[PDB]
Design a protein around this nucleic acid. Structure first.
Lengths: 182, 124, 131, 46, 105, 200
RNA sequence: GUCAGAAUCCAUGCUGGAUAUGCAGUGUUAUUCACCGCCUCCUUUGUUUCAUGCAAUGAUACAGGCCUCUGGCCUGCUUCUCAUCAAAGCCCUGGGCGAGAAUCUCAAUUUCUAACAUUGGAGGUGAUACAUCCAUUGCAGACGACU
RNA sequence: GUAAGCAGAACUGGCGAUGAGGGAUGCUCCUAACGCUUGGUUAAGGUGCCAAAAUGCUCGCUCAUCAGAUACCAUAAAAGGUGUUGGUUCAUAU
RNA sequence: ACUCGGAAUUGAUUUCGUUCAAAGAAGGUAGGUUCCUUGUGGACCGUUAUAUCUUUGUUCUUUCCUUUUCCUUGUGGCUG
């Protein structure tokens, strides 16, 4: 009943692996990382890829302990996110800082892969979102965020093209439609 | 045997979908073997006692409340003298009751058209 | 330019699973899509509905901004906006299309007997008022 | 453009009337004879 | 005069089940008046259909029929598959077809 | 599953978007008239579309251009081509579809009948505003369609003709709905509340 | 948002139009039994890419419109008309009278729409011609054609 | 070898000996290999019309007086743009 | 092939939600000032007051989603 179509199917996951015991080196140092992914499996894939860049570890030489799903605390109300990220253009790599507004962190990251692909043509494979912090209104530094802030904000509905539920739709009509609506 | 549907309780108005009396609205008495519906008033509609198959029949929410019923059986049905007397014996009770409501007596006597705009999946 | 996407404006939801139910706005998320809900008894769970889907209604109840779903229900019961919309036209013919769908066969017969009897009296006056 | 209505005179000569026949010598020469009695009975309708 | 009181839904023969490059004229393809989704279609499944047409000669009347029935829906629109006793002739295309509303429920 | 005739008003309409709807309906067996084809619209500016129509005039059979692509200047005849462009018209079935179609640049005959509108293929809906568009009546009169200013005159004549019809009808829409309000009182008070459930 | 502007482009003019199997107006329409029309009334057959209410006449705008306009309406032909009471039957000027309709024995297209052409009948009004060959011409011409 | 739908090798897979569905069209690409068939489900690939299936839903970018549009594939580069949409980092709102 | 339904379980042993209590805040309500373009206005000051929200406990809720195994009624197709 809840509409599948609006959002991407991102969920946030914590991951914790630890390399692997040896007779030289027993009890290693443990790791932790928050990741965004489709699934409980595909988080672990992305964990081992990212941990390979940091430290001399692999999926064969490593061992994973826990994959905790994380969600929002309170998803009812709207909040500002300052997303840090990197991506790979056809020249080279660039770090960015985007600012997105939605009810959830999952909703923000869904909205960002749309935005990032649409502008910069950045493929899903290249993007790696580094950290997604919650931000106060008096903190966002982007101008498109600032217009929205303030109580009593109003927005008039202009040019009302309605996506008719199917079956409602007919190929011919009589009257010609009315878009200003009022 | 053929199971009844949860619409068809005894009393209730049907409508016939095929045969010589297509359209006409007809009240249901009893299920009989062969699992057929004994569906019958001849002064009102001009259709007799007859066995109509369950699947050539739309049930309706409208209903009517004496009648003999239990004597009549499938051996009967498979110009005539005895049949005309059995008819008017059976519709003693209904003609008295359907003397009351003239919206209801008209409702039987009219027959059901698919009229233009109406879509019989978004029916009722 | 009447009608604003603002807190506590009433909305007819035209597309989506709800289809035809009424809702209140809470909060504007960004320039598309708004934090639509209903406490009751429309019974639309609160969500990030797009702006395209929802026709704005004339009536609003005034409440401040992002809002708990209980504190609609208190502020609703004083005003009764959902009742007041339902008085006016558009509101009436919304309920007509619900109750036309739910007619019986005898209930559809009832209508056309009354409507034809009206036209006998309608044609008698149309001749008489001419005379 | 499109022709609405042609009006003609009362009395054409045999000079004009030859145009309407390919064989003048055979024919009984009927062209504008029903029209001429219709004209005397003129064309201020048309 | 005219036919009194119609008890059928009315319907067009679109074509056959196909690809770009292959008919499958076993399975005819059918549009119904009013009906506009898969959700609206599930009334009409099972329900029995007739292509009628007329011929120059057979058994005491100039008209023929090909009976069939509705099988299953076809795509997210209303359109619905059918099976007739014979395969349908390709003369019958953009051609009217009576969907009766028995068998009932 | 369809009407006897469906007359289309073609003002406000986008040329391809209209034609693609109209094509498929001709194949389903519907008989169609199109009407006021001079007022039909196209996206892009006037200069842009005339430059595209000049690429079309450049085409001809070089051996003997009597034979080759017929460049049709009239708006009615232009719309007719793009509908035929969306049909397998060499095959026999495709030809039958064109037979159903009737296109006019408004005559007598079907001023008297109603004109419908395809809402999906419509400029106020589709073209995001500011984005420059072009009327086909302008584009055709640029490229040697002589009869612009008659289709001005005849329409302007029969709009005055239609507004005379309107004010008769509008007076006797009042007159029926006045006699409705008497008749709704005098029939009994149960059945008044019955109709106000179901709208009438 | 406009304006001027070329040996350019499109018209105009000019050539064709058996280059649209395109379309309009007008003349005369068969020596009096002899065929031939037109308009009603009613029957023989045979055509239809397609009868089952296959229905509905302001004109616009979309950062606005419409009026029954001190008010009311828009957010769809998603509506508004049409559909009854006995037979697709019979009787009374378009509405209204009555009548045991079935055993068409559990469904078999609900055989009758529409205009178009055609065979033969009733009554009303009408009409009494041309073209080709042939001979002649030379404004024309391979032969047809054309004058 | 400047390069070639050029010449000569290594490993595996094809074409040749091989149709079917897709790439509009193609011996070699993709899916997938074939006894006659009824029903169901997918693959590659697609859903405005030709054409079976979305004028589906949802979020960005683009206005082209030669827009662009799907691997093999039917070409485009150096160098520019105060056209527009974002980013990185300095300096006083620019 | 598509459906009306439920019954227990897993996570963060509640994601939420909801009743209170204190604390804090701004995208600052009542309340003061004041200002026009008189508004369903804006600046300054005010912290719940004639609106509120968030953090942190607490009152009683098993559904959103997500593991796990399993009993269900409704329509239709093909073959016998």
């Amino acid at each position: 009943k809840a509409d599948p179509t609006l959002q991407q199917k991102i969920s946030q996951y914590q991951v914790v692996g630890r390399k692997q015991p040896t007779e030289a080196e027993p009890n290693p140092s443990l790791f932790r990382m928050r990741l965004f992914a489709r699934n409980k499996v595909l988080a672990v894939s992305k964990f081992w890829y990212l941990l390979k860049k940091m430290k001399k570890v692999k999926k064969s030489t490593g061992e994973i302990l826990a994959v905790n799903e994380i969600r929002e605390k309170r998803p009812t109300f709207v909040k500002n996110f300052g997303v840090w990220l990197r991506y790979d253009s056809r020249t080279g790599t660039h770090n960015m800082y985007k600012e997105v507004r939605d009810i959830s962190q999952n909703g923000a990251v869904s909205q960002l892969y749309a935005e990032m692909a649409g502008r910069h043509r950045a493929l899903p494979s290249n993007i790696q979102i580094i950290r997604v912090a919650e931000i106060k209104a008096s903190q966002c530094r982007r101008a498109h965020m600032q217009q929205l802030f303030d109580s009593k904000l109003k927005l008039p509905a202009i040019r009302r093209i309605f996506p008719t539920p199917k079956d409602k739709k007919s190929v011919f009509c009589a009257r010609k439609p009315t878009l200003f609506l009022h | 045997m053929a199971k009844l549907r949860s619409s068809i309780t005894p009393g209730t108005v049907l409508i016939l979908l095929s045969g010589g009396h297509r359209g006409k609205r007809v009240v249901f008495l009893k299920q009989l073997p062969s699992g057929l519906l004994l569906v019958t008033p001849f002064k009102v509609n001009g259709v007799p006692l007859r066995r109509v198959n369950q699947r050539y029949v739309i049930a309706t929410t409208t209903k009517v409340d004496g009648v003999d019923v239990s004597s009549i059986k499938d051996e009967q049905f498979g110009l005539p003298a005895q049949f005309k007397q059995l008819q008017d014996s059976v519709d003693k009770a209904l003609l008295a009751s359907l003397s009351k409501d003239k919206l209801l007596t008209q409702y039987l006597k009219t027959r059901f058209t698919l009229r233009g705009n109406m879509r019989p999946h978004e029916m009722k | 330019f009447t009608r604003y996407y603002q807190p506590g404006r009433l909305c007819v939801v035209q597309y989506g699973p709800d289809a035809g139910k009424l809702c209140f706005v809470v909060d504007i998320i960004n320039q598309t899509r708004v934090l639509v809900d209903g406490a009751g008894v429309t019974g639309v769970k609160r969500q990030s509905m797009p702006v395209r889907r929802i026709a704005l209604t004339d009536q609003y109840l005034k409440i401040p901004r992002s809002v708990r779903s209980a504190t609609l229900k208190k502020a609703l019961e004083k005003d009764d906006v959902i009742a007041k919309f339902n008085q006016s036209s558009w509101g009436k013919r919304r309920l007509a299309k619900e109750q036309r769908a739910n007619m019986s066969d005898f209930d559809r017969f009832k209508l056309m007997v009354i409507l034809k009897q009206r036209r006998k009296v309608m044609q008698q006056k149309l001749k008489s008022l001419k005379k | 453009l499109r022709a609405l209505v042609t009006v003609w005179a009362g009395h054409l000569s045999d000079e004009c009337k030859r145009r309407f026949y390919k064989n003048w010598y055979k024919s009984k020469r009927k062209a504008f004879t029903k029209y001429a009695k219709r004209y005397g009975d003129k064309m201020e309708a048309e | 005069t005219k036919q009194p009181v119609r008890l059928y839904v009315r319907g067009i023969v679109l074509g056959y089940k196909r690809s770009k490059v292959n008919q499958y004229p076993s399975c005819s393809l059918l549009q119904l008046e009013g009906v506009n989704d898969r959700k609206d279609t599930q009334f009409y499944l099972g329900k029995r259909v007739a292509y009628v047409y007329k011929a120059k000669t057979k058994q005491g009347s100039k008209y023929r029929v090909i009976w069939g029935r509705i099988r299953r829906p076809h795509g997210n629109g209303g359109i619905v598959r059918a099976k007739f006793r014979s395969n349908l002739p390709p003369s019958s295309i953009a051609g009217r077809v009576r969907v009766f509303l028995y068998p009932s429920n | 599953t369809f009407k006897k005739v469906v007359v289309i008003d073609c003002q406000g309409h986008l040329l391809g978007r209209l034609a693609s709807v109209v094509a498929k309906e001709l194949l389903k067996g519907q008989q169609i008239i199109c009407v006021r084809c001079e007022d039909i619209n196209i996206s892009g500016s006037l200069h842009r579309n005339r430059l595209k129509y000049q690429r079309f005039l450049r085409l001809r059979m070089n051996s003997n251009p009597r034979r080759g692509p017929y460049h049709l200047r009239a708006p009615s005849r232009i719309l007719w081509r793009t509908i035929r462009g969306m049909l397998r018209h060499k095959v026999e079935r495709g030809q039958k579809a064109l037979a159903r179609l009737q296109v006019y640049e408004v005559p007598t005959m079907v001023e008297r009948k109603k004109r419908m509108v395809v809402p999906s293929a419509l400029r106020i809906v589709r073209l995001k505003p500011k984005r420059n568009f072009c009327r086909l009546g302008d584009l055709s009169s640029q490229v040697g369609w002589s009869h612009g200013d008659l289709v001005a005159r005849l329409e302007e004549k029969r709009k005055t003709r239609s507004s005379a019809y309107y004010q008769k009808k509008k007076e006797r829409t009042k007159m029926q709905t006045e006699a409705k309000q008497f008749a709704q009182t005098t029939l009994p008070k149960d059945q008044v509340a019955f109709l106000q459930q179901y709208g009438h």
